[PDB]
Design a protein around this ligand. Structure first.
Ligand SMILES: *[C@@H]1O[C@H](CO[C@H]2O[C@@H](C)[C@@H](O)[C@@H](O)[C@@H]2O)[C@@H](O[C@H]2O[C@H](CO)[C@@H](O[C@@H]3O[C@H](CO[C@H]4O[C@H](CO)[C@@H](O)[C@H](O)[C@@H]4O[C@@H]4O[C@H](CO)[C@@H](O[C@@H]5O[C@H](CO)[C@H](O)[C@H](O)[C@H]5O)[C@H](O)[C@H]4NC(C)=O)[C@@H](O)[C@H](O)[C@@H]3O)[C@H](O)[C@H]2NC(C)=O)[C@H](O)[C@H]1NC(C)=O
Ligand SMILES: *[C@@H]1O[C@H](CO)[C@@H](O)[C@H](O)[C@H]1NC(C)=O
Lengths: 99, 269
């Protein structure tokens, strides 16, 4: 059986322009475990991000968290991009500051 | 009855390494927090977060590593067997652990799954593996080639588990009693034609059990579409969305219930 990933983007503390914080991309409910994930700043991959251990829940589907330090500003756009067998093309999802 | 603290190990192994995953890895949990990590590209079990500072008997972490290296061999061999009698790739998972009885004795758990579905079980009091699928036989048979296997798996669950659990309940009482309430925010943004979306967000709380309830003029009005996820440092983050009429945003509030709060907390826009 295969299962497409659910993808969610949010920050650790309440966001504020010009203030240091941390950006999270939470990818869950997928199968198989083989997957690719990257964080973007204005369309360009951001280097040296971090990743949690790959784990799983009661129903056997997998989950993991990608994150990095960042300082939001009015004009920069942040996003998360993932590749998986169940996806016909890479899926890019933009950060929503209200989450 | 009372909150029964469980200790559980999450195990996995795969054949396809084209995305850089190790062949075998595992994590361990006390309730909702992770205390252990391990993967075959490193050969050692390590503590996580605050558990790095727990006062333990000197052989503790060495024994976790050895019991896990044992499980790694059983799993990887099971994969190669299947890869010989059947076509395709595989993913094998296991969920093992226990809870304490009134007399401090063990209440075990042991289930397995192949490519996403349950296909086997193990009874420690009798030493046998069961299930009803052609693969159940291929694997169970392999694991019965050596009598020590069944005996060691039985000891891990009926002796070791309750022992480590009673030990953490003692040395890590402080971490286990963690009750921290969420920081809250409520905001409005443009929605579909003629509507606004309201988002109630909760930051950095523990344990994960939490309840959202939107209010309109002070009365209950729905729970909204909600979700939760890990926050990066062991704590959790959650949010709930409700669609309302454009212009009536100010009539609404958000209220949450959590173990770390003396009573429900109400939040404003
Ligand atoms: C709270 O949570 C609610 C439920 O939760 C889940 O809901 C599901 C649906 C998912 O959203 C989960 O993530 C949620 O957890 C939530 O749900 C409510 O909203 C959803 C979303 O609107 C409702 O269902 C949706 O329906 C969609 C319909 O498919 C069309 O639109 C998609 C874009 O949104 C397209 O991707 C899709 O391909 C399809 O597109 C249209 O296709 C037409 C046919 O091919 C085409 O029409 C033709 O066009 C030609 C010209 O080109 C001619 O005109 C011809 O005559 C036409 O026939 C269109 O052009 C095309 N449109 C576009 C833009 O390309 C699904 O695709 C969605 O995936 C989703 O299922 C859902 O039903 C509803 N809930 C309920 C219970 O009903 C709710 O919104 C949440 N509330 C809040 C406040 O957040
Ligand atoms: C179980 O452990 C508790 C806590 O140390 C102890 O008080 C009790 O005597 C032990 N055995 C039983 C039967 O309660």
């Amino acid at each position: 059986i295969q299962k497409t990933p659910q993808i969610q983007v949010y920050s650790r503390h309440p966001p504020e322009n010009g203030k240091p914080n941390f950006l999270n991309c939470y990818v869950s409910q997928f199968h198989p475990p083989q997957i690719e994930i990257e964080l973007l700043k204005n369309g360009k991959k951001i280097p040296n991000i971090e990743m949690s251990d790959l784990s799983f829940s009661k129903d056997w589907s997998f989950y993991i968290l990608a994150h990095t330090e960042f300082t939001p500003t009015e004009t920069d756009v942040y996003a998360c991009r993932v590749k998986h067998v169940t996806l016909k093309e890479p899926k890019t999802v933009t950060w929503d500051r209200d989450m | 009855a009372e909150p029964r603290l469980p200790l559980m190990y999450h195990l996995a192994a795969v054949s396809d390494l084209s995305t850089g995953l190790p062949s075998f890895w595992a994590t361990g949990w006390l309730g909702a927090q992770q205390y252990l990590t391990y993967n075959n590209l490193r050969q050692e079990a390590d503590p996580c977060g605050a558990w790095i500072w727990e006062n333990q008997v000197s052989w503790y972490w060495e024994k976790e590593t050895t019991d896990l290296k044992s499980k790694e061999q059983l799993f990887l061999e099971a994969i190669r067997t299947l890869e010989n009698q059947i076509n395709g790739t595989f993913t094998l998972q296991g969920l093992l652990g226990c809870e304490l009885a009134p007399d401090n004795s063990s209440l075990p758990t042991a289930v397995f799954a192949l490519n996403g579905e349950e296909f086997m079980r193990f009874n420690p009091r009798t030493g046998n593996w069961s299930g009803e699928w052609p693969e159940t036989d291929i694997v169970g048979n392999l694991w019965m080639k050596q009598p020590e296997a069944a005996r060691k798996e039985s000891e891990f669950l009926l002796t070791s588990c309750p022992e480590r659990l009673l030990g953490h309940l003692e040395r890590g009482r402080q971490n286990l009693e963690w009750k921290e309430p969420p920081s809250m925010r409520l905001k409005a943004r443009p929605g579909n034609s003629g509507s606004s979306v309201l988002t109630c967000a909760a930051f950095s709380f523990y344990p994960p059990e939490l309840k959202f309830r939107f209010l309109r003029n002070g009365l209950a009005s729905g729970s909204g579409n909600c979700s939760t996820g890990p926050n990066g440092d062991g704590s959790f983050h959650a949010w709930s969305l409700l669609e309302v009429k454009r212009g009536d945003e100010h009539h609404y509030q958000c209220q949450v219930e959590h173990e770390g709060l003396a009573q429900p907390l109400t939040v404003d826009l």
